[PDB]
Amino acid sequence: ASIEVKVQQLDPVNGNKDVGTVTITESNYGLVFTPDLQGLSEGLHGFHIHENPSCEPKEKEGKLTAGLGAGGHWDPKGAKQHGYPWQDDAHLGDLPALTVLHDGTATNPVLAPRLKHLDDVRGHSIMIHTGGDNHSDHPAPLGGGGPRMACGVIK
């Protein structure tokens, strides 16, 4: 199937920067997210669909905060819990973590088996966090992803 999402590193003060794409296709097992990203920090990063079609910042306690315009994790079924990509009572936007190599690149595709159709993700955003993802709300909320590092709107 295919949606090419342009992703930018978020910096409300100094300016957002292009870091590449995430291409979304359909497989017989769910949606596949194929990154082609550069310039990110080495490690595993939380990777989720967020509810709003926006990567804009929003104030939080008077601080203009990167990516908050995207809202929370996409949760149309009201799971109200962060979890695993293969967990039915987790947010539907919970994707497998994104791998960024030592050289700052990400090319490894990942499968979201609960997302079945491309139209399901249109009108939302894809977020890449500074932290990782332990697929739980303990010991940190939302898998420990923390701040929003990079984002793209899915059209």
Binding residues for Zn(2+): 73, 82, 91, 94
Binding-site partner at residue 127 among Zn ion, Cu ion, its own copies, none, CB < 5 to 8 Å by type: Cu ion
Binding-site partner at residue 82 among Cu ion, Zn ion, its own copies, none, CB < 5 to 8 Å by type: Zn ion
Binding-site partner at residue 94 among Cu ion, Zn ion, its own copies, none, CB < 5 to 8 Å by type: Zn ion
Q: Is 118 helix (H, G, I), strand (E, B) or coil?
A: helix
Residue 61 has which token pair? 């306690």
> Which residues of the shown chain bind Zn ion in the complex (CB under 5 A)?
73, 82, 91, 94
Closest approach of Cβ 151 to its own copies, in Å? 22
User: Which residues have C-beta within 8 Å of that of residue 48, sequence separation ≥ 6?
Assistant: 73, 74, 91, 93, 94, 95, 126, 127, 129, 133, 142, 145
- φ, ψ (nearest 5 deg) of residue 43: 140, 180
Q: Per rule CB under 8 A, is residue 32 in the interface with its own copies? A: yes
Q: Per rule CB under 8 A, is residue 152 in the interface with its own copies? A: no
Q: Considering only residues 78-107, where is the footprint of its own copies by CB under 8 A? A: 84-88, 96-97, 99, 101-102
Closest approach of Cβ 29 to its own copies, in Å? 4
Q: Identify the residue whose tokens are 């097992």.
A: 29
Q: How many CB atoms lie within 10 A of CB 58?
A: 16
